[PDB]
């Protein structure tokens, strides 16, 4: 291989990330409507809801449900999932 990298001296700048209160799975403000339900004609199910698991990070029940039909776990950290 004609070119081999011996050293690399790199510069990087850091800034702060911005923080907002969001369903991480879909992204919509917690306290606000889950997105699929924002795109919905007003429905029975249209009254998704705040769910918390033991891990303490929180989701729209709507979103975390379809997350839990697939894996058994929590998406953010990784833990098998029980409510609170």
């Amino acid at each position: 291989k004609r070119f081999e990298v011996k050293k690399w001296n790199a510069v990087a700048l850091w800034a702060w990330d911005i923080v907002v209160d969001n369903c991480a799975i879909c992204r919509n403000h917690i306290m606000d409507l889950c997105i699929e339900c924002q795109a919905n004609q007003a429905s029975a199910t249209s009254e998704c809801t705040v769910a918390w698991g033991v891990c303490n990070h929180a989701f729209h029940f709507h979103c975390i449900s379809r997350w839990l039909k697939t894996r058994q776990v929590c998406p953010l950290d990784n833990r098998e999932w029980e409510f609170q």
Partner: protein, 258 residues
């Protein structure tokens, strides 16, 4: 202006410092801009004579013009130390895993206090990836909530060559490295192909090729072509020259652009 430059040209004892500090009293802000830049360069490039002396200069300015005048200064310094300890920790954290085949360092800077800006479009070379992948995920462990912005155009490295009659150490820009590395695939590349690959804005890429071409390593289809003149084009062909020779084994190809 030069009232500033003089200090960095001298600093590139504390007596000869104070001997400026008198002339300091004499529009100190536009001065502090320039002096900042001076310091910044003296920092990222390492060097800068005696560090304790730089600190004594700072703290000398501290009481003089008060807190906010200095503070960005102080932030650059402690940013440097912070980077030293960062690198230490990283070398220790990798110590249980497969090592990096290259020799890695990074200075991380507070985006706020440093003049440096805007990064550039760039495509990180695969050979450069794992280092990056590893350190990114490391910083995220030491600080959540932070974002890292890599400034390649200030990033330098060392290539080692296997295809020459002789083995060279090339001290190069990261744009240089990214270009050259492209030659482990093919022996000739059109400039277009090189922007579609290293993702380097053509405006920049041109000057960079011009440097490499000036360097022995790459060559045009036209041998009679003056590289200090001829204007490179999308379909222009850049060839690797295996005829390369140097009376130096470790050679630095990374040079002020003109």
């Amino acid at each position: 202006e030069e009232l500033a430059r003089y200090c960095d040209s001298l600093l590139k004892l504390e007596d000869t410092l104070n001997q400026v500090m008198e002339k300091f009293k004499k529009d100190k802000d536009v001065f502090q801009k320039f002096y900042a830049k001076m310091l910044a360069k003296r920092l990222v490039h390492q060097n800068s004579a005696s560090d304790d002396a730089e600190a004594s200069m700072i703290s000398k300015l501290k009481q003089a013009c008060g807190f906010e005048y200095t503070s960005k200064l102080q932030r650059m310094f402690q940013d440097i130390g912070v980077s030293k300890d960062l690198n230490e920790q990283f070398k220790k954290h990798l110590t249980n895993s497969e090592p990096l085949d290259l020799d890695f360092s990074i200075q991380v800077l507070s985006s706020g206090s440093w003049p440096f800006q805007q990064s550039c479009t760039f495509a990180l070379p695969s050979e450069l990836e794992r280092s990056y992948q590893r350190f990114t995920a490391f910083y995220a462990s030491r600080h959540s909530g932070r974002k890292l912005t890599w400034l390649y155009q200030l990033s330098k490295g060392e290539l080692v060559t296997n295809c020459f009659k002789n083995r060279y150490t090339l001290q190069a820009s990261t744009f240089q490295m990214a270009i050259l590395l492209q030659y482990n695939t093919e022996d000739a590349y059109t400039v277009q192909q090189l922007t579609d690959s290293t993702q380097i804005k053509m405006d920049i890429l041109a000057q960079v090729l011009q440097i490499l071409l000036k360097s022995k390593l790459l060559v045009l289809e036209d041998e009679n072509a003056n590289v200090d003149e001829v204007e490179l084009k999308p379909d222009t062909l850049i060839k690797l020259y295996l005829g390369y020779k140097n009376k130096k084994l470790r050679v630095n190809i990374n040079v002020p652009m003109k």
